[PDB]
Symmetry: D2
Subunit: 62 residues, 4 copies
């Protein structure tokens, strides 16, 4: 059973845009969401979480 | 005639700590999306990190 | 509302591996699956369909 | 220590009409996956097209 890396972006109730706040391994997108919520929020009303597999991101070169 | 899918753009500024979502754009591939984001959103500032992600790769939490 | 391209692979009941059999536009992975099933199969018992966004595929250079 | 996610590999042979799934492998990125697939699955045959896809990008129909 595979556990790929996911990058996690959160936009708080107060906030206006999704901020990257870390990465975690999970078997799928839904598991990644339930972890992200547990681990990076405090069970708060109104927080939007995005998950993305790391393989999906392309970064600018240094 | 090529496909121009939607990409989400995240930027971390020079003195910035994390990547923040700053908008979307349509581009034929990841490298064109980077190039476009560099111009449209960072204005070629030194020291800025850009991440592009095809929209289809993002799973959002349910309202 | 966006309609990205998806690549579709099908493994028939009889078959041993998923074969690419085309591409279609859909709003999400689930819509892509219901189209693929309608359009590339004949509502048949035992067919496995995979959908992948085109942006996800990396190809070897000519 | 790098991540080595799972990739699905599809190949279309020289005289072949479509890409067929031929297996999986773990690799640090798409270019390393291509290189590995080229060796592991095609043995560097001329005229063969290889597609690699991270596993997370595939949605399967439900049994």
């Amino acid at each position: 059973k595979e556990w790929p890396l996911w990058e996690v972006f959160v936009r708080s109730k107060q906030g206006l845009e999704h901020k990257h706040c870390g990465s975690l391994h999970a078997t799928d997108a839904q598991q990644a969401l339930h972890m992200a919520r547990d681990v990076y929020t405090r069970r708060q009303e109104g927080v939007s979480i995005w998950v993305v597999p790391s393989t999906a991101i392309t970064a600018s070169a240094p």
